[PDB]
Design a protein around this ligand. Sequence first.
Ligand SMILES: Nc1ncnc2c1ncn2[C@@H]1O[C@H](COP(=O)(O)OP(=O)(O)O)[C@@H](O)[C@H]1O
Lengths: 450, 450, 144, 561, 145, 145, 63, 37
Amino acid sequence: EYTGITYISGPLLFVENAKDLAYGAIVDIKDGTGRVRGGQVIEVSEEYAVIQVFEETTGLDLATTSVSLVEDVARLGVSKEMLGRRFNGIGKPIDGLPPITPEKRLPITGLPLNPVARRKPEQFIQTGISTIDVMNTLVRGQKLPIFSGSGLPANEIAAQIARQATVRPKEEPFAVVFAAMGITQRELSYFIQEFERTGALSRSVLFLNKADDPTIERILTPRMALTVAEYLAFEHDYHVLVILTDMTNYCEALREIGAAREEIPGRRGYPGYMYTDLATIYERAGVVEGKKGSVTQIPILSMPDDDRTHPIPDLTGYITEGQIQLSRELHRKGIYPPIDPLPSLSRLMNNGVGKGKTREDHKQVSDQLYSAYANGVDIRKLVAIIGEDALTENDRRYLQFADAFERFFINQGQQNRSIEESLQIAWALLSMLPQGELKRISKDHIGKYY
Amino acid sequence: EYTGITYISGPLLFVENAKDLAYGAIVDIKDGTGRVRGGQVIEVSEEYAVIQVFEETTGLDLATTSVSLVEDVARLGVSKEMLGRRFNGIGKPIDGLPPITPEKRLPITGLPLNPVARRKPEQFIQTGISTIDVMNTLVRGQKLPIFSGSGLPANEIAAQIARQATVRPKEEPFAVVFAAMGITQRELSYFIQEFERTGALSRSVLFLNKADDPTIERILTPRMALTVAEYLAFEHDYHVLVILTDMTNYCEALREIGAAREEIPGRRGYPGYMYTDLATIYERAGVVEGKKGSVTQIPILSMPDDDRTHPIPDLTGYITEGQIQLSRELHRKGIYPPIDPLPSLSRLMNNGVGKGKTREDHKQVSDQLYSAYANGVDIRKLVAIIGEDALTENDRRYLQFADAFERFFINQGQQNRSIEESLQIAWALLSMLPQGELKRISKDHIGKYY
Amino acid sequence: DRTHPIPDLTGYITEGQIQLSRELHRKGIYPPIDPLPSLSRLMNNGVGKGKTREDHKQVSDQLYSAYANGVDIRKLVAIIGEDALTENDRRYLQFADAFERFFINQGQQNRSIEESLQIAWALLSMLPQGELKRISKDHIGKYY
Amino acid sequence: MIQGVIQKIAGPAVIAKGMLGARMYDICKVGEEGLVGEIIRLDGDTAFVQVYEDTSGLKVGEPVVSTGLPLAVELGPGMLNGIYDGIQRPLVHALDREKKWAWTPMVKPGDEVRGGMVLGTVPEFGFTHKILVPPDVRGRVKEVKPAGEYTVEEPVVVLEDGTELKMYHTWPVRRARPVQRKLDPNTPFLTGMRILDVLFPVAMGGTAAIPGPFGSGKTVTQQSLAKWSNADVVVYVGCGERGNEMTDVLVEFPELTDPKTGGPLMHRTVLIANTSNMPVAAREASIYVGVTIAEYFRDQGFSVALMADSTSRWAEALREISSRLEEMPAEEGYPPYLAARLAAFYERAGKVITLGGEEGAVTIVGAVSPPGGDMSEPVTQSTLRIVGAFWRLDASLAFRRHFPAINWNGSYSLFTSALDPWYRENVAEDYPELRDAISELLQREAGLQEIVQLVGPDALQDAERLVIEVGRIIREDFLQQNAYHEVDAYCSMKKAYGIMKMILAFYKEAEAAIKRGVSIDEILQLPVLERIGRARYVSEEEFPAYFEEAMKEIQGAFKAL
Amino acid sequence: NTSNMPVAAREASIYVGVTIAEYFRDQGFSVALMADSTSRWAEALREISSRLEEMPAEEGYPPYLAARLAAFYERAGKVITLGGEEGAVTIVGAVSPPGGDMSEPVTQSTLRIVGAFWRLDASLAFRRHFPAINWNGSYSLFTSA
Amino acid sequence: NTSNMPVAAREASIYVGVTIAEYFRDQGFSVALMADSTSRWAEALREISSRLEEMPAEEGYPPYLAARLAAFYERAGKVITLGGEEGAVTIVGAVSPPGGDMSEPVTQSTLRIVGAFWRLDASLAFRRHFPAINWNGSYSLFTSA
Amino acid sequence: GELLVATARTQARGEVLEEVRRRVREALEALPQKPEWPEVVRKLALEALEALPGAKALVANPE
Amino acid sequence: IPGIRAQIRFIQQVLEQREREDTFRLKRIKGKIEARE
Ligand SMILES: Nc1ncnc2c1ncn2[C@@H]1O[C@H](COP(=O)(O)OP(=O)(O)O)[C@@H](O)[C@H]1O
């Protein structure tokens, strides 16, 4: 059925229909355009008029311009053949190959499949990075954010995990879904070249959204990516790892339209709905029904203005099972990866460690390293207050342990550390502390492992 | 005359009248309800429509539902028989007794009676608490706030003053008006039981507003209380002490509606009118015409988030003659009452002390105790710096005096101390200091009282 | 507050800035000009041979550098004590006082550029000649 | 058009509805598609409805019907082990109509009854369900079923010669169930966690806010309480779920065990999910549905715990509905109406004397999640003003591996005095004095550390170094608890006081030794100290033996001088 | 981009320049695009937006700015021009915060896009240390590149 | 200017007083205008402004205050009255910052207008040095005059 | 080399889809020059008025 | 050591300067958006 534009303000277009109103979420097509221009219905205003959001620029639209209702929302051309292809935010080819030949056509909001099981995340994902695998282990079904800031190599880490990740002897096949949002042409060319050269592309679906692509296409990008992941995990029984960079850039686009949508702004100018839209993305992870597959997320959260309390990064923390927080201060000291060892945590961590998973002493070692590093970092403050020479012998050992933790445990010369390798480094650095000061390691473990 | 609802949004209901508009503040009654539902007129919108605020839930209201105008607000049923009764924020019985039999029916905004004289507050009110009577004397006609924070026993202090306060040989009878706002059912049951058991109820009118009572009833509570106080003071010649807890909770309710009223918010989200509404309450205190009676206020001001600079507590300071500021830090050191001795002021103390009020040596003793306690507290720092043994003999006495002040003067085993009792303890602890070190007590007082 | 948006946006509209400081005024130094925050944007277009004198840029650079070092050393004196300052630093400390007493301070008085350069060279003598990093040797021999 | 209506318009999230002449303000309404909505605006010619889901499933002309509730809920046999949602219904009916329950008569014909009176008993699930005369019904029992088996719909009794009573009853979730009197806070809600039970007590029927930033351990306090608190039933409103926190609980909790019995915890729990795909309406109503179910169980004479994940997200869902209704935004764009509402919720908490005597209670533990550390509006600010208790998980305490990560300086109860007598009578006569003494220790440490931050630690006297030494032992040996250790995961009341007395006894001895010129360095390396440090790992009273081991060791230090 | 010129022209100035810049790199030249500055371009754009009644956000700037500014800097790069040959457009943009605040518009959004930042330091300048580039606060993600 | 009085009246009080003051100087009298205080007058004005929904600035005070306060103090002076003869209005205004902060409203704007400032010093008072005027922090730009 | 296969299948698989489409469109393009075309044309216009729109008129080629 | 508290004190007040006043150009901007709308 056809309608006519009655109003245009930036990305928001009002459209009046004389017969049949299109339901909320339907994709409408603007007639008379050189390139396809989609309008997604957002509201019914009354008087046979709907309010919509454009998926591309609205320059050149005129009042009265015709619009058709496609009869459905937007969708994913789902197939195992998604693997090995590079696509746009909307799932259109970017690799000069033919459009996907769908096995099924899936809605992308998260309603399709109802894939998740009511079971806890478990079992190992080997990223090949020691500071993750050894100390902050990623588990199948978990959401473990990379917490960073502008100027830091968060995307290098994301790309490296995409190249290296596997599920060591699993009966299930492994796949990566890599989605980039609001990236430059240079960054897009780099990501493409990297996937193609390494042969990482063979087991990956890649979605790339450029900075100059429509804001609506950026909003749809993570939904295309999560739908592909859920399809591969649930219908093909795969352990799928989804890497989303950067959630902050996704948020800048969603925030950009909230104003055009008529909402009263919330703190820091953000959309009032920040946490319930973001929840639609972090809810989509975990073991899938059947327990053959799973969806794991590694979202990148850059601090705007390096502020971890900004509403975007701050609301993302609850959606994760492991967090890796990068710090500019640490990067400026030449410590890479620039991980803050006292602000990186593991959640569902207890479900993926111990005898029969990693090793029996894993929790004790993790607890002791965390405690000693936190004490050592506070003592850096105490050194500044009193002077190095006024520090007690015992405190000096904890001060030194913090440097050892940073130099040897956090720092990896790019290098795929097994959990055994990571625990060994952990025990080696722990030797710097007095044995009498290992409050968080039971004597059984000291005798067996020290 | 009858009207019809034209709009309902939560507590705000618009009502259109074809004949006779009800004036602002009138109580309207919604027809067709199982339990009485009052609507208080707040504004005249134009077009014969008024905007109102509901005193109970609006679920089940329909557009067109009928409403009658009662012809009046709420109002105070004034009588000497108000004494000995417990009432709601609106002056309805809570004690299972009959409704008040009015001698006069008074408006409650402060316009009735025009009771105040253009004379300064004077003469003693014995609270029975040494830290008030001795050092920060409450005077008849004064406004002396209790300045506290969440978790602190400000209500215990308020209740104790209600039980103990008197006007020592005055030819005039004494009465208490105790008003509580936004309190729990548990707190209401406790306050009731306390007044009834002690026999404090015999000389008190008590108004209790619960957290779940209508917000408008909370706003009216302090006005019912002040009107009763002014009636007893002016028409019956009584010295009346009004205790209002908590002004911050009153403010949370007034702030809650400012948004529904269409105002642009001021700092910290507060109503732009914060200071000119609050002024309508703090203006109502002082000696009454005839100089037989007076109205004194002890408002409780809890710091939201412990911030004494929040606009609510900060604007209240100007309305007081004595301020008692409680501090969480002090409470956490086990010092009770948790009064900050360097932030409590006889903003009006000098007007309620001396010969014919308390005793001639009161100012000198208060000055000396304050000076010695402040020196003693600084010396606790000096002890930490140099060690106890390196402190001079003279400083050791001041150090010890601070402990004596805390152990014996601040600490009360719940106990109603007369000002004479409080000055006696003060002189007893002062003996610990060298007589040659009593710089702030004239020799005349040392000879007579030491 | 020199960072308030009004004064801060005005800086770009200028070719010379003279910044006055309350702290300096409270020390009795008038005019209360901050010698390390007053600049000339187009200064190089109005100085040198045929305009002022050939050594003008070098002298201006050296006085600015020495005064800035001397002011920082006032902080170092407060940190360590006067007696713990090196002999070399003491000269720079003293130069800052000399710059303020003799160059900044004028007893109301119309100084020619020749007069101003002369005072500049006179105060510069307080510094070790080996410490005049910003004055080429050609100028030292000709003007020192 | 009294009970039903027809959609006039939809878009911009509000459905305008013609009719529904008898709908109440704030009633749930049902669209033909199956979506629910809340009646927000009642106008002379329409009802404005907030839709709790996607509005494209609503079209002009669609039929809309009343539900009649702020309520309702079914309250009878079949509630236990059951999993419902925001408006009670299998995760549709509510109570099985086919299931047969063994009814046991507890009243004879001729007995006079009143609302709340117990007429029968049903061992539906051990638990023994108590059949009560619905509130507002009294008279004489004219007919009563004999001991047999019956379905819910069957009539088991008649009163006043014809009101008919069944094993279940309905009640408006929006209306707090009646009671004779709400007993003042008197009985502690025995948590089993030393810091809580000792320093920041929660009273049975108390409201104690749980507040702090994301990932501080707020939910975990709640979950441990349910696994071990002295409430028979738990009502978990696992709101603010996202990414997979839904599936994280979907197939997980169904395996979590009841430490008390060794059976599934769900066997005494009711889950109320609040996912992001759910309308703001449903999440808004979720606390009211839960509290009503909570009040229902306390009516039986049970002590129930209501855990609210969280109210920050409920206020965001409410702000979305309000802004869509064009209500005037205030601070952080929140509607003016929130403070009175939130307070009204927490007011429904309390230990009462149920209808027909007997005592029960609903204790509320609410999670606080400010937009991000700001800890202002919505959640925190308004909540911390209502609640009597606040357990502040501290991220810095957590990073330091001090568990539970509850800040003993920023937390408060208002239940400490309320529960002290339970501890004094059942556990230890010196519970209150001991926790006050430890807190004064921690308070003194805080002050000392502030000064040391300025003038350094070199000037510190031996007396001040001792206080830091013992203060540190309190933090490491007491405050910190290992949730991952098979033993220290739970610390029985008896163990909590015994560890406290070992620490406090070491303190007294420490201060006594210093006063006699014993070097603090000598005390700091005292052999018993390492044992005191591992005391939390001992599951036997071998812990109180440490007191005598401490005294003799100090004597060996009084010997050497 | 003078003050008497409409906000429109100054807004379009970076786009006219970048297009001319891209034109020369197409020939196989390496061109440098120096943008005095984007703080003033965002003020001209905020004036146009407010006149169009678009909803003001932080510092009253329209929501649309971050995506736009990024889109500009994305047109930078060394390419293989149409018909082979290599050329490039390097961008150096000036940052002028309202006054030392170094927040919005300019700085904040820019420092998030750009790969290089050369921090002239007024204290380094007063000290006569030239170039006055702070070697502690500056960064090139390009060092390894 | 009591607390029960509208912000309006207290706002107008300095203008009513100054006019009466100017009236007496017109006769050829030297009058002193003592203003207890302008901090409270600016708080009454901020209440009126916020109720009128005028945009709050620093400490939530309206932008309009500085020009107004200055305009008040400008009406001070010794004049040659209409029909010759000399008279004058000398103003002494009290300054009461929110609390020691000595910023806005009162102090800040006032100390910028007034030519004289007599700083009562609480430490000078505690030391029993009267008048408690700090001879180091007080100033009169009239010494030479 | 593994990628070197998948793409060579993709090109082949493409070519076949693109020929199935070529034909499907040849069918419709040469549809008017046969019978049963009139019954098609009317049935299209039927739905135009049969759908949401109220009645008025329709248009086509002059054949 | 009263050097610490000294110039480092300048420290706390440029710090404090920076934002109870900056944090305020702001509670009030956002008012300003739909405060102005
Ligand atoms: N008592 C505890 N013992 C050990 N780890 C804990 C504890 N509480 C929280 N944590 C750690 O912090 C994480 C976040 O806690 P959680 O309760 O889920 O956060 P929130 O405050 O957001 O509800 C837990 O998953 C665990 O990793």
